[PDB]
Amino acid sequence: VTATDYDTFVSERFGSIIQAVQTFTDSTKPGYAFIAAKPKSGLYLTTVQREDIKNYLKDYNLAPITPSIISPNYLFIKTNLKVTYALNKLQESEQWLEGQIIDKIDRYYTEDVEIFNSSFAKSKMLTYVDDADHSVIGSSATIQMVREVQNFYKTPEAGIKYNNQIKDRSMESNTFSFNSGRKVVNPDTGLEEDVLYDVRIVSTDRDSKGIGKVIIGPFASGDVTENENIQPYTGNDFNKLANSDGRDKYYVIGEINYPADVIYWNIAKINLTSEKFEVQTIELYSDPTDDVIFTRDGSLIVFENDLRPQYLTIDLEPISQLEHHH
Amino acid sequence: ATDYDTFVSERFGSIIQAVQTFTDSTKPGYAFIAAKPKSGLYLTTVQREDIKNYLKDYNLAPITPSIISPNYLFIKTNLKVTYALNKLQESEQWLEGQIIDKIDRYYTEDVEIFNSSFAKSKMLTYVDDADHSVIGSSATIQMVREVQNFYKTPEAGIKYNNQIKDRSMESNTFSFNSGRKVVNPDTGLEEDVLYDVRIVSTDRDSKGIGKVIIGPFASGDVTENENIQPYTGNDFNKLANSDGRDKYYVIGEINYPADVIYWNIAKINLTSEKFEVQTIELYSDPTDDVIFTRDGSLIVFENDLRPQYLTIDLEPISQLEHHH
Incomplete structure (x- = not known):
């Protein structure tokens, strides 16, 4: 858990085509853990809309809360x-x-x-x-x-x-x-x-x-x-x-x-x-x-x-x- | 500018931090040298009479350069x-x-x-x-x-x-x-x-x-x-x-x-x-x-x-x- 722990998690399993990670949680949107991700090159990760992201969705450990990998x-x-x-x-x-x-x-x-x-x-x-x-x-x-x-x-x-x-x-x-x-x-x-x-x-x-x-x-x-x-x-x-x-x-x-x-x-x-x-x-x-x-x-x-x-x-x-x- | 300013900038480098000459299109005949004290703003009328009195040092009889701030x-x-x-x-x-x-x-x-x-x-x-x-x-x-x-x-x-x-x-x-x-x-x-x-x-x-x-x-x-x-x-x-x-x-x-x-x-x-x-x-x-x-x-x-x-x-x- 912990966004920091998650930020790493991705600065590893992906630490390839990703430059930065911000794991924040929105107080308006409970149970959702948001993951900002800079492509390290361009702007949007899968502007193709998650052909790559959706991939990060496909990383699961524990918790009743759900990831929402955004740009x-x-x-x-x-x-x-x-x-x-x-x-x-x-x-x-x-x-x-x-x-x-x-x-x-x-x-x-x-x-x-x-x-x-x-x-x-x-x-x-x-x-x-x-x-x-x-x-x-x-x-x-x-x-x-x-x-x-x-x-x-x-x-x-x-x-x-x-x-x-x-x-x-x-x-x-x-x-x-x-x-x-x-x-x-x-x-x-x-x-x-x-x-x-x-x-x-x-x-x-x-x-x-x-x-x-x-x-x-x-x-x-x-x-x-x-x-x-x-x-x-x-x-x-x-x-x-x-x-x-x-x-x-x-x-x-x-x-x-x-x-x-x-x-x-x-x-x-x-x-x-x-x-x-x-x-x-x-x-x-x-x-x-x-x-x-x-x-x-x-x-x-x-x-x-x-x-x-x-x-x-x-x-x-x-x-x-x-x-x-x- | 520097033709005469520099000299002056030698015999007085301990005060003046900026010296340049120029003419006034208009005040024909007159050549002025602006100088800024390193030590502030306006050279003192004694500091100014000394510096003017090197104009004699270098012989020129014509009315010769007005120093000024x-x-x-x-x-x-x-x-x-x-x-x-x-x-x-x-x-x-x-x-x-x-x-x-x-x-x-x-x-x-x-x-x-x-x-x-x-x-x-x-x-x-x-x-x-x-x-x-x-x-x-x-x-x-x-x-x-x-x-x-x-x-x-x-x-x-x-x-x-x-x-x-x-x-x-x-x-x-x-x-x-x-x-x-x-x-x-x-x-x-x-x-x-x-x-x-x-x-x-x-x-x-x-x-x-x-x-x-x-x-x-x-x-x-x-x-x-x-x-x-x-x-x-x-x-x-x-x-x-x-x-x-x-x-x-x-x-x-x-x-x-x-x-x-x-x-x-x-x-x-x-x-x-x-x-x-x-x-x-x-x-x-x-x-x-x-x-x-x-x-x-x-x-x-x-x-x-x-x-x-x-x-x-x-x-x-x-x-x-x-x-x-």
Whole structure:
């Protein structure tokens, strides 16, 4: 028993295609012993869905509790890097240089951060970035935590957490398409099926107890049917998106507990069927109050640029030389 | 630069830590040498007359190089370091000391030098480096140019050698003296009412230009004739009041892209006499986190003597539902 004993158990019987193990138990889900497992190479163990994992299921000794071999709950860092260097000090291209900083940003992660109950610090990685040339003068960054959400429709039973604290309104997802039942025409073309607009999930400033709503919109006046319950969110209090289509009526569908660090929603709370949504997986961005981001239970801060390039933009800036004369 | 600076840097290496020459495009004919005491900030007028009197040593009859103290750019740093409770042995008061040293060691080595530059990203890695227990830091900077005369910018202008943001330029506050009597038996029979005032900049125009406007007044004590009339824009930062004061006026102007700042209080009929200061400090947010020096400007951390330009917030961590 004991998660620690189990972590080993697997750092042996598998200690081949596995880099790390976190055996934690969830207080919401009794009798279930959860086993986080980093593939040591990629991201998901049997993304093929357990052709390998299921194998770990197939390891049994004692107890009335049952294993649930999962892939680690990944925290991502959407970094907007802005390194600046000296035109002259540089001998190879900006292209070769990028491939030089991300070689470092990786060295940091995989040595200090990509570990269980281990953490990430922006200041500490920007030291690694700075440390890629004779110049390279300095560097800026703007990060957000990312949680990848399977089934956009609704969060888990027990909500999703970051293992970190975010700021008011900080929480927002990427946009996805909502197929309004309605139909419209332009450019000599026809019905064009059903009108679609870009819609998304955002949080609101916390109330006097640490608790804002999780709202979704915009909409039409519209494509969502209003009840005694279902009513457009009452007031400004968050981040609205570009109505290049003019729209705006958002609806409440959950809440963030900022202090408790839990976020729940369920689109079924209004009456939209997942059919009315193109997507399956979405991204949930928030920006921390943390100058240090903590991983934790089954959570793991990882940097996989190749397979997750989207989570890193590098904007370089070249600089004129100074005094060359003496 | 070094052609004559170096020498000097030999006969005086025991004081001066930074020497460079330059001309002023404009003050044609004049060559100045900025020098920073290793021992602080401003060389003393005796230290300065000695050093000037080696100019005779090396024979030159023409008026020959003015020695002078460097044009300092200061970084008002608002630092935040979060550290691990377990791994920190001594006092918080100690830790600060330990890092406020690191900052200086970075400044002395990589920054306090002519045309070398300050990189917030670097000094933070110095901060990180100060203890084995300093998990991670963050930081917010401002630029401080310390103005010799508040009343009017130099003939030419004042510049940061760096890009600031909109409304960003703002001096501190200085007492303006209206001229009215207060009639208060508390302190006799007459105090001469004097309310604070500052000089801020407004938003870039179509074309890159802002207006350098000057803090709140009470209608009467500034005379307006058509031309010189209250500024109206709300495109700047107004200040905390307790008084009925909301009349700001326009002098000079900021050329944001060419960073030049000229103003002249005279543009409103207010003699120096009217203000009880002679020196001020101009702040402003950089655009970037890498800031630069140029002709005779020097960036410097002199913290036991400019302590007002650093503040440290620590955040002790354990494990852990919370660090703000």
